Amino acid sequence: SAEQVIAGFNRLRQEQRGLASKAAELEMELNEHSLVIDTLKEVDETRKCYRMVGGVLVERTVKEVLPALENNKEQIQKIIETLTQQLQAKGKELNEFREKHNI
Amino acid sequence: VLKKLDEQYQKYKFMELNLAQKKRRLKGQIPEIKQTLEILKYMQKKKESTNSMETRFLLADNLYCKASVPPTDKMCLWLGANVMLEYDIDEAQALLEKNLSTATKNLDSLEEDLDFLRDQFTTTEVNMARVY
Amino acid sequence: GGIIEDSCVLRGVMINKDVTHPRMRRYIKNPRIVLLDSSLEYKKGESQTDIEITREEDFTRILQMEEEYIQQLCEDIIQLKPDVVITEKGISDLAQHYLMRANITAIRRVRKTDNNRIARACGARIVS
Amino acid sequence: NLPQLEMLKNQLDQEVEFLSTSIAQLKVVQTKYVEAKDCLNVLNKSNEGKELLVPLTSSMYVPGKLHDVEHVLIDVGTGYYVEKTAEDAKDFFKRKIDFLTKQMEKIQPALQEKHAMKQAVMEMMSQ
Amino acid sequence: APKTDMDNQIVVSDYAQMDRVLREERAYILNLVKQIKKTGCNVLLIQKSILRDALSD
Amino acid sequence: VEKYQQLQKDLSKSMSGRQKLEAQLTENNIVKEELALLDGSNVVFKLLGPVLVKQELGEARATVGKRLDYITAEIKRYESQLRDLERQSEQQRETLAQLQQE
Amino acid sequence: AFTELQAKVIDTQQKVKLADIQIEQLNRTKKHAHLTDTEIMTLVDETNMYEGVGRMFILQSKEAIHSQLLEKQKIAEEKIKELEQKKSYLERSVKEAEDNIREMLMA
Amino acid sequence: DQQKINKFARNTSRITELKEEIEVKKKQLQNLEDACDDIMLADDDCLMIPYQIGDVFISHSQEETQEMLEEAKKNLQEEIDALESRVESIQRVLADLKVQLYAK
């Protein structure tokens, strides 16, 4: 009856304020992406580019070290845009759903 | 009407406050970054082995070694994500000052959004008051 | 239920005392019931008792040494042809668990009064 | 009725959580003394004189040329600095390894108590 | 050391400000003690610490 | 009302680091064990404040007799601040609540 | 005596579950200590290569590092079984408490 | 919307903004005072005093640490004081923006 009215009344206002929650959830992820792919590529990779791991500091050439930060961040950016975007519309629909089932 | 100004007055003032927040966190990461350089600074020795000094090496937090420190000129710095490029005493300080803006640029994009959601607050609400 | 005229007496001690419900299978015809006065307590080590089990390692290491001892025990039970083993002593989480692994019904934490009545029922003794 | 349960269901969650976080943090610091024992192993193993990148500041490591692989810290007292032999570290670590060991274990019973208790508060709410 | 809060030359509020006047409780009790052997004694009669206000161990 | 937990905070505050000291207490008795078994083999610095200083053995020893003054001093003082804050906290509870309800 | 058996199921519950993710990481740093070994093998010779098990990064030649790092593989390579072997008696003990009650009411 | 929306808040935004960069340099000044007490308390220069820079320690007598402490203390105290006057200015502007908001 009033379940859709309260839903649509809520969703435009909920999505609106969730946009910051949406964009910030992507932000702090991309926040550390900035400290990494930048600091490697800007300064000369010509010399030896280590890999820092747990029980080892791995020796590596740029040739392996460079593309790792390239594609990984970019591959991450696809997936993060997907779910946080899908979270808002779920809340939109779940606000309509939770009033229905719980009799 | 007092109805139209009240709805706008807070949503601006709430998200106008957001302008100062990241703008401050812009200038708020400066202390994080530059003292790290201050670490390297006294350490930095050119026309000498950098930091020719005492130390207790950090093997772990609980585990130190007193050694004669001086290395060949270099500082291996933490770039992030298992990427370590070597930096010699200077590129280090240079790279180390780079950690200023990169995380400082982690910020205003929300402030901008916050300011731009601020105008999404006001633009919606006036119609939202009229629509519903 | 039944009438006292239908009530009677049969050889040995009828145990209704611990048995108002399933206790030792239902009908174990020839096969034995095993009264246990052992000395069955599952050994934390092999021949030695060690620290009790508070943690995963204690489960792993000790049950290694525990399960084989009840095996060392209730395999000496399987030779006497029980289809049921009523465990008065040495009854513990591992003990009766191995009798189903010893392919014999195990029966838990029972009164020896019965088992002494039972020592007059099948008329056996009980052995440690 | 359920209002008691609904407050009782929500409360008993957090003490699981509060304790879930604690013991989870009591393994790490316990594990570093294991690793501070381990970091000392490769230390003696290579030799005195090796270049050691050692934590310097945010985003940096300072390389340095090792000396006296027998040098170890032991921090006892409050912050107090006790430099010890390569042997003395391992046992002092193992004390504080064993010291947090119990400290880990004290949490689990009180960790788990508020779940199965909360779990009992879920049923009569729905049932 | 003089008792400004319970027995200690510290006052009770936080951890930081007291540790510097924890340093104060330190030296004072030692100095008086140092002063003891500095005017010097081979044996020291000590009454009870209840027969004292307090005696820092 | 505001006056409730103002006191219980610094109660809980100096409560825990005091208890941190109890771990350090054993250590402060063990540091009397560790340094006393150090004859100057490994370089003994005090770690006392942020300056890490070239130190001597009596400086190492007299310090930990003085480092026990941590566990001595910080533990004791709080048992004041415990009830010092606790009572004024307990006091202010029924007063301002009954008002706002009444 | 039905009471004492409710703990060992909840006790092992936090345990047999723990013993699963444990063997996981041990297959992980295994092939990774081979993978990290692969990347130091990727550069033909490095002395400035640092293998140490902590924030001390301690200069060693690539090769003795490999043996150190391939044994670092071998370590976690070894550790997979025990903690899976740990998932067994745990799940064995949880039932031993259960087979107490179930036997009398069955049989 | 009126002009007091932007002025009153962005002022108040700057008020708390300007008072904050003050405070942190007061306590580090006090924190830098602590290591002073510490070489005053023990190893008075009866032995050399190293001063921690990152991991490594620079060998010296007592004062040099206290200097580097006091050096940073003085690097700290000044950006306090101009901003002591700077939040001073912006907050009085608020007390002005208060009344200017009320009278209309």
Side-chain angles (χ1 to χ4, degrees), chain A residues 9 13 16-17 19-20 23-24 27 30-32 34-36 38-40 42-45 47-53 57 60 65 69, chain B residues 11 76 78-87 91 95 98-99 102-103 106-110 113-114 117 120-122 124-125 128 132:
Chain A
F9 179 83
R13 183 59 180 166
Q16 186 175 355
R17 294 170 295 184
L19 295 175
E27 186 179 6
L30 178 63
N31 285 346
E32 182 64 16
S34 296
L35 275 66
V36 179
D38 174 65
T39 56
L40 173 64
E42 178 277 335
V43 57
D44 288 344
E45 291 172 345
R47 61 184 178 276
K48 293 179 296 297
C49 299
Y50 297 100
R51 176 182 179 173
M52 182 60 75
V53 296
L57 172 58
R60 293 174 65 187
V65 176
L69 300 182
Chain B
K11 297 192 303 295
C76 297
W78 175 250
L79 285 65
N82 298 132
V83 170
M84 174 165 281
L85 175 60
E86 180 177 356
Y87 300 92
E91 295 175 349
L95 177 71
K98 300 298 287 186
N99 195 26
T102 183
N106 289 343
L107 306 167
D108 287 350
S109 295
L110 183 57
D113 185 7
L114 297 169
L117 175 59
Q120 290 177 335
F121 284 110
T122 297
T124 300
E125 186 67 15
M128 185 68 179
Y132 294 136

Side-chain angles (χ1 to χ4, degrees), chain A residues 48 50-51 55 57 59 61, chain G residues 39 43 48-52:
Chain A
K48 293 179 296 297
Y50 297 100
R51 176 182 179 173
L57 172 58
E59 174 64 18
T61 304
Chain G
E39 293 176 350
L43 271 66
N48 195 29
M49 174 69 180
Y50 296 135
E51 179 175 6

Side-chain angles (χ1 to χ4, degrees), chain B residues 44-123:
Chain B
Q44 176 167 351
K45 294 177 179 296
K46 295 299 184 182
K47 294 183 173 72
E48 182 181 2
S49 294
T50 299
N51 55 330
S52 297
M53 293 172 183
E54 282 184 347
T55 187
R56 302 298 176 275
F57 282 157
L58 193 152
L59 282 59
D61 292 345
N62 302 129
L63 191 72
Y64 296 155
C65 286
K66 181 175 186 291
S68 294
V69 49
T72 303
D73 285 343
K74 68 180 183 296
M75 295 295 177
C76 297
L77 265 62
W78 175 250
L79 285 65
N82 298 132
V83 170
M84 174 165 281
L85 175 60
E86 180 177 356
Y87 300 92
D88 298 347
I89 315 301
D90 293 343
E91 295 175 349
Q93 184 174 357
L95 177 71
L96 187 61
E97 183 65 14
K98 300 298 287 186
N99 195 26
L100 171 58
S101 296
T102 183
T104 296
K105 294 180 183 299
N106 289 343
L107 306 167
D108 287 350
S109 295
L110 183 57
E111 173 182 358
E112 295 172 350
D113 185 7
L114 297 169
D115 183 357
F116 298 156
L117 175 59
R118 187 186 73 197
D119 293 346
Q120 290 177 335
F121 284 110
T122 297
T123 301

